[PDB]
């Protein structure tokens, strides 16, 4: 892995990001969910790097990246991604993928950096903003995690993050996810919770998208259910919708091979070298 100070248009202007960068050629950036880290995309990074250059950062406040206290807006996280791509000399187009909060970041990136997208991968996410109660629950989480740490978040979220088959067949996956949550920096968790609460409604952004989009959801996702994600996909032009069987909210971890294959086959169609040159 790498750790670099990048220049970002968001406050505070410079931030240290930890990231993986594996493979050569056409760039695919994968953005983790809340309150996880870059390791949730490990299988896809390790497999897709035979064909693509896969960049997987820890977002501000997560994993090994710098923690910026206050509010970490989705826009700021997108600005950081643009700054990372700038640092790396990836100033043309990328494919940007995100899961859950990472999807929110992807929408913020599409708003501001549309000409930098060859494609979007939206996993287990939604375009609507938080409802008022959901916003308040963000704030409650933020205020508590600063003091108590994320154990209470793991307790609440783990049963909702993965399907029954994952608990049975892959207890090691459950434990990896649990350790991601338990290790998440408290002030980073708080800042991102507050940022999610104030994110805009991206519903109307979707019909205005101008790149191919893959929408992926676990069959048993309890947080962003497949029915809702299918409806979201029907608002996005040039979309492909895939349900991953026997996965909940975290298909990349729960059904890694199925996710890798879905992404690989779509990338082959959408993210070509001639498209990069011209
Ligand atoms: Cl957003
Ligand atoms: Cl909500």
Tab-separated table of C-alpha atoms and ligand atoms in Angstrom:
chain	number	residue	atom	x	y	z
A	1	UNK	CA	0.000	0.000	0.000
A	2	UNK	CA	0.840	3.667	-0.332
A	3	UNK	CA	0.252	6.738	1.790
A	4	UNK	CA	0.463	10.144	0.138
A	5	UNK	CA	-0.397	13.692	0.984
A	6	UNK	CA	-2.754	14.843	-1.790
A	7	UNK	CA	-3.983	18.180	-2.752
A	8	UNK	CA	-7.803	18.453	-2.555
A	9	UNK	CA	-10.146	21.316	-3.369
A	10	UNK	CA	-12.067	20.462	-0.202
A	11	UNK	CA	-11.118	21.762	3.199
A	12	UNK	CA	-8.402	21.480	4.500
A	13	UNK	CA	-6.696	21.584	1.095
A	14	UNK	CA	-4.294	18.706	1.769
A	15	UNK	CA	-4.972	15.298	3.179
A	16	UNK	CA	-2.979	12.120	3.617
A	17	UNK	CA	-4.677	9.140	1.974
A	18	UNK	CA	-3.726	5.522	2.305
A	19	UNK	CA	-4.524	3.506	-0.784
A	20	UNK	CA	-3.838	0.415	-2.797
A	21	UNK	CA	-2.916	0.729	-6.499
A	22	UNK	CA	-2.556	-2.586	-8.308
A	23	UNK	CA	-2.275	-3.433	-12.005
A	24	UNK	CA	-1.596	-1.419	-15.090
A	25	UNK	CA	-3.621	0.303	-17.697
A	26	UNK	CA	-7.173	1.471	-17.588
A	27	UNK	CA	-8.087	2.843	-14.149
A	28	UNK	CA	-10.901	1.624	-11.884
A	29	UNK	CA	-11.308	3.305	-8.497
A	30	UNK	CA	-13.336	1.418	-5.884
A	31	UNK	CA	-14.787	3.217	-2.859
A	32	UNK	CA	-15.674	1.410	0.357
A	33	UNK	CA	-18.756	1.833	2.524
A	34	UNK	CA	-19.393	3.059	6.043
A	35	UNK	CA	-17.709	2.461	8.480
A	36	UNK	CA	-15.379	0.136	6.572
A	37	UNK	CA	-12.022	0.504	4.777
A	38	UNK	CA	-10.224	-0.298	1.541
A	39	UNK	CA	-9.873	-3.944	2.475
A	40	UNK	CA	-13.521	-4.617	1.715
A	41	UNK	CA	-12.569	-4.497	-2.008
A	42	UNK	CA	-9.485	-6.698	-1.631
A	43	UNK	CA	-10.759	-9.667	-3.694
A	44	UNK	CA	-11.776	-7.491	-6.602
A	45	UNK	CA	-8.505	-5.569	-6.540
A	46	UNK	CA	-6.422	-8.752	-6.461
A	47	UNK	CA	-8.386	-10.394	-9.287
A	48	UNK	CA	-9.183	-7.513	-11.640
A	49	UNK	CA	-5.573	-6.323	-11.694
A	50	UNK	CA	-4.801	-8.825	-14.467
A	51	UNK	CA	-6.783	-6.605	-16.836
A	52	UNK	CA	-7.238	-3.206	-15.136
A	53	UNK	CA	-5.434	-0.799	-12.795
A	54	UNK	CA	-7.427	-0.936	-9.575
A	55	UNK	CA	-7.090	1.931	-7.087
A	56	UNK	CA	-8.701	1.453	-3.670
A	57	UNK	CA	-8.330	4.262	-1.121
A	58	UNK	CA	-9.253	4.559	2.516
A	59	UNK	CA	-11.559	7.575	2.534
A	60	UNK	CA	-10.766	10.500	4.809
A	61	UNK	CA	-11.264	9.409	8.391
A	62	UNK	CA	-11.156	5.675	7.627
A	63	UNK	CA	-8.594	2.936	7.662
A	64	UNK	CA	-5.094	4.372	7.570
A	65	UNK	CA	-6.071	7.743	6.030
A	66	UNK	CA	-5.845	11.054	7.856
A	67	UNK	CA	-8.779	11.877	10.106
A	68	UNK	CA	-10.320	15.361	9.455
A	69	UNK	CA	-12.667	16.186	12.323
A	70	UNK	CA	-15.961	17.970	11.924
A	71	UNK	CA	-18.052	17.035	8.955
A	72	UNK	CA	-16.770	14.942	6.048
A	73	UNK	CA	-19.219	15.738	3.291
A	74	UNK	CA	-19.744	13.449	0.317
A	75	UNK	CA	-18.529	16.334	-1.853
A	76	UNK	CA	-15.306	16.566	0.166
A	77	UNK	CA	-14.722	12.850	-0.191
A	78	UNK	CA	-15.254	13.162	-3.972
A	79	UNK	CA	-12.846	16.106	-4.092
A	80	UNK	CA	-10.274	13.935	-2.342
A	81	UNK	CA	-10.747	11.238	-5.004
A	82	UNK	CA	-10.222	13.792	-7.756
A	83	UNK	CA	-7.058	14.922	-5.945
A	84	UNK	CA	-5.800	11.340	-5.686
A	85	UNK	CA	-6.377	10.786	-9.386
A	86	UNK	CA	-4.551	14.068	-10.066
A	87	UNK	CA	-1.599	12.944	-7.868
A	88	UNK	CA	-1.379	9.671	-9.747
A	89	UNK	CA	-1.487	11.341	-13.164
A	90	UNK	CA	-4.987	9.817	-13.883
A	91	UNK	CA	-6.308	13.094	-15.249
A	92	UNK	CA	-8.402	11.564	-18.091
A	93	UNK	CA	-11.327	9.273	-17.412
A	94	UNK	CA	-11.791	6.593	-14.808
A	95	UNK	CA	-14.421	4.055	-13.864
A	96	UNK	CA	-15.601	4.888	-10.347
A	97	UNK	CA	-17.301	2.259	-8.211
A	98	UNK	CA	-18.757	2.624	-4.745
A	99	UNK	CA	-20.676	0.587	-2.216
A	100	UNK	CA	-23.280	2.168	0.102
A	101	UNK	CA	-21.684	5.439	1.395
A	102	UNK	CA	-19.166	4.934	-1.387
A	103	UNK	CA	-22.125	5.184	-3.779
A	104	UNK	CA	-23.019	8.510	-2.189
A	105	UNK	CA	-19.435	9.619	-2.852
A	106	UNK	CA	-19.746	8.416	-6.441
A	107	UNK	CA	-22.851	10.582	-6.923
A	108	UNK	CA	-20.982	13.575	-5.506
A	109	UNK	CA	-18.135	12.855	-7.939
A	110	UNK	CA	-20.514	12.548	-10.883
A	111	UNK	CA	-22.012	15.940	-9.975
A	112	UNK	CA	-18.725	17.761	-9.966
A	113	UNK	CA	-16.347	15.728	-12.169
A	114	UNK	CA	-18.640	14.332	-14.886
A	115	UNK	CA	-16.000	14.662	-17.597
A	116	UNK	CA	-13.670	12.382	-15.633
A	117	UNK	CA	-16.057	9.367	-15.795
A	118	UNK	CA	-15.926	6.543	-18.272
A	119	UNK	CA	-18.418	4.634	-16.128
A	120	UNK	CA	-19.992	4.209	-12.709
A	121	UNK	CA	-20.480	1.100	-10.578
A	122	UNK	CA	-23.160	1.616	-7.902
A	123	UNK	CA	-23.403	-1.183	-5.356
A	124	UNK	CA	-25.884	-1.476	-2.511
A	125	UNK	CA	-26.697	2.221	-2.309
A	126	UNK	CA	-29.388	4.839	-2.895
A	127	UNK	CA	-29.727	8.262	-4.493
A	128	UNK	CA	-32.283	9.716	-2.080
A	129	UNK	CA	-31.023	11.714	0.905
A	130	UNK	CA	-31.505	10.717	4.515
A	131	UNK	CA	-35.039	11.144	5.874
A	132	UNK	CA	-35.307	13.425	8.917
A	133	UNK	CA	-35.183	10.521	11.374
A	134	UNK	CA	-32.247	9.004	9.555
A	135	UNK	CA	-30.419	12.334	9.794
A	136	UNK	CA	-31.062	12.493	13.504
A	137	UNK	CA	-29.842	8.932	13.911
A	138	UNK	CA	-26.566	9.968	12.146
A	139	UNK	CA	-26.115	12.693	14.657
A	140	UNK	CA	-26.788	10.342	17.555
A	141	UNK	CA	-24.211	7.906	16.191
A	142	UNK	CA	-21.653	10.675	15.717
A	143	UNK	CA	-22.018	12.016	19.218
A	144	UNK	CA	-21.775	8.564	20.776
A	145	UNK	CA	-18.950	7.098	18.684
A	146	UNK	CA	-16.615	9.974	19.571
A	147	UNK	CA	-16.741	8.757	23.169
A	148	UNK	CA	-17.614	5.051	23.049
A	149	UNK	CA	-15.966	3.959	19.802
A	150	UNK	CA	-17.696	1.855	17.143
A	151	UNK	CA	-18.527	-1.322	19.100
A	152	UNK	CA	-22.185	-0.301	19.338
A	153	UNK	CA	-22.176	0.260	15.553
A	154	UNK	CA	-20.836	-3.222	14.892
A	155	UNK	CA	-23.512	-4.649	17.192
A	156	UNK	CA	-26.290	-2.804	15.346
A	157	UNK	CA	-24.987	-3.160	11.788
A	158	UNK	CA	-23.495	-6.677	11.505
A	159	UNK	CA	-26.880	-8.477	11.460
A	160	UNK	CA	-28.088	-6.087	8.755
A	161	UNK	CA	-24.924	-6.179	6.629
A	162	UNK	CA	-24.768	-9.805	5.576
A	163	UNK	CA	-27.133	-12.586	4.710
A	164	UNK	CA	-27.879	-15.790	6.606
A	165	UNK	CA	-25.806	-17.875	4.206
A	166	UNK	CA	-22.723	-15.729	4.914
A	167	UNK	CA	-23.100	-16.250	8.676
A	168	UNK	CA	-23.305	-20.026	8.053
A	169	UNK	CA	-20.690	-20.550	5.377
A	170	UNK	CA	-18.309	-17.662	5.962
A	171	UNK	CA	-17.934	-16.750	9.614
A	172	UNK	CA	-14.411	-15.580	8.712
A	173	UNK	CA	-15.943	-12.941	6.446
A	174	UNK	CA	-18.229	-11.774	9.230
A	175	UNK	CA	-15.221	-11.428	11.492
A	176	UNK	CA	-13.235	-9.457	8.882
A	177	UNK	CA	-16.143	-7.022	8.550
A	178	UNK	CA	-16.474	-6.763	12.301
A	179	UNK	CA	-12.799	-5.901	12.645
A	180	UNK	CA	-13.104	-3.214	9.949
A	181	UNK	CA	-15.869	-1.568	11.962
A	182	UNK	CA	-14.170	-1.981	15.322
A	183	UNK	CA	-10.962	-0.422	13.955
A	184	UNK	CA	-12.624	2.577	12.314
A	185	UNK	CA	-11.304	5.860	13.789
A	186	UNK	CA	-13.983	7.322	16.099
A	187	UNK	CA	-13.738	10.887	14.831
A	188	UNK	CA	-13.641	9.651	11.229
A	189	UNK	CA	-16.824	7.691	11.806
A	190	UNK	CA	-18.440	10.757	13.383
A	191	UNK	CA	-17.381	13.092	10.600
A	192	UNK	CA	-18.716	10.754	7.914
A	193	UNK	CA	-22.000	10.163	9.758
A	194	UNK	CA	-22.549	13.919	9.851
A	195	UNK	CA	-21.544	14.162	6.197
A	196	UNK	CA	-24.057	11.526	5.175
A	197	UNK	CA	-26.786	13.384	7.053
A	198	UNK	CA	-26.230	16.518	5.033
A	199	UNK	CA	-25.783	14.949	1.586
A	200	UNK	CA	-28.088	16.229	-1.128
A	201	UNK	CA	-30.840	14.362	-2.874
A	202	UNK	CA	-29.268	12.765	-5.948
A	203	UNK	CA	-32.565	11.449	-7.389
A	204	UNK	CA	-32.605	13.932	-10.258
A	205	UNK	CA	-28.866	13.519	-10.926
A	206	UNK	CA	-29.459	9.994	-12.199
A	207	UNK	CA	-31.393	10.726	-15.401
A	208	UNK	CA	-28.725	13.324	-16.200
A	209	UNK	CA	-25.793	10.880	-16.026
A	210	UNK	CA	-23.659	10.644	-19.126
A	211	UNK	CA	-21.657	7.446	-18.666
A	212	UNK	CA	-22.513	3.696	-18.628
A	213	UNK	CA	-23.554	2.510	-15.161
A	214	UNK	CA	-23.550	-0.926	-13.540
A	215	UNK	CA	-25.959	-1.270	-10.594
A	216	UNK	CA	-25.255	-4.200	-8.323
A	217	UNK	CA	-27.185	-5.422	-5.259
A	218	UNK	CA	-27.215	-8.457	-3.019
A	219	UNK	CA	-30.322	-10.617	-3.314
A	220	UNK	CA	-30.854	-10.314	0.438
A	221	UNK	CA	-29.625	-6.749	1.029
A	222	UNK	CA	-31.517	-5.536	4.091
A	223	UNK	CA	-30.296	-1.940	3.931
A	224	UNK	CA	-30.687	-1.060	0.216
A	225	UNK	CA	-33.082	-3.738	-0.954
A	226	UNK	CA	-33.049	-5.118	-4.499
A	227	UNK	CA	-36.534	-3.859	-5.367
A	228	UNK	CA	-35.464	-0.322	-4.530
A	229	UNK	CA	-32.152	-0.655	-6.374
A	230	UNK	CA	-33.905	-1.998	-9.486
A	231	UNK	CA	-36.182	1.037	-9.445
A	232	UNK	CA	-33.127	3.271	-9.077
A	233	UNK	CA	-31.464	1.556	-12.060
A	234	UNK	CA	-34.546	2.260	-14.182
A	235	UNK	CA	-33.851	5.981	-13.728
A	236	UNK	CA	-30.283	5.741	-15.030
A	237	UNK	CA	-29.622	5.726	-18.782
A	238	UNK	CA	-27.231	3.120	-20.170
A	239	UNK	CA	-27.625	1.028	-17.034
A	240	UNK	CA	-27.164	-2.649	-16.351
A	241	UNK	CA	-28.704	-4.160	-13.213
A	242	UNK	CA	-27.341	-7.304	-11.523
A	243	UNK	CA	-28.618	-9.093	-8.440
A	244	UNK	CA	-25.934	-11.145	-6.687
A	245	UNK	CA	-27.501	-14.288	-5.205
A	246	UNK	CA	-26.841	-15.259	-1.611
A	247	UNK	CA	-25.441	-11.879	-0.544
A	248	UNK	CA	-26.698	-9.077	1.652
A	249	UNK	CA	-25.414	-5.498	1.723
A	250	UNK	CA	-21.775	-6.491	1.184
A	251	UNK	CA	-21.609	-8.623	-1.977
A	252	UNK	CA	-17.892	-7.854	-2.636
A	253	UNK	CA	-17.065	-9.657	0.629
A	254	UNK	CA	-19.925	-12.185	0.730
A	255	UNK	CA	-19.830	-13.363	-2.925
A	256	UNK	CA	-16.475	-12.074	-4.122
A	257	UNK	CA	-16.202	-14.191	-7.257
A	258	UNK	CA	-19.682	-13.283	-8.478
A	259	UNK	CA	-18.984	-9.598	-7.917
A	260	UNK	CA	-15.590	-9.773	-9.627
A	261	UNK	CA	-17.145	-11.478	-12.644
A	262	UNK	CA	-20.048	-9.023	-12.928
A	263	UNK	CA	-17.624	-6.107	-12.787
A	264	UNK	CA	-15.101	-7.708	-15.149
A	265	UNK	CA	-17.607	-8.454	-17.864
A	266	UNK	CA	-19.117	-4.950	-17.718
A	267	UNK	CA	-15.708	-3.266	-17.704
A	268	UNK	CA	-14.753	-5.194	-20.857
A	269	UNK	CA	-17.730	-3.641	-22.611
A	270	UNK	CA	-17.462	-0.075	-21.244
A	271	UNK	CA	-13.851	0.716	-20.391
A	272	UNK	CA	-11.773	0.317	-23.531
A	273	UNK	CA	-8.399	1.635	-24.570
A	274	UNK	CA	-9.726	3.384	-27.699
A	275	UNK	CA	-12.197	5.223	-25.458
A	276	UNK	CA	-9.264	6.318	-23.282
A	277	UNK	CA	-7.254	7.661	-26.264
A	278	UNK	CA	-10.144	9.429	-28.049
B	1	LIG	CL1	-24.058	12.256	-2.245
B	2	LIG	CL1	-33.448	7.645	5.040
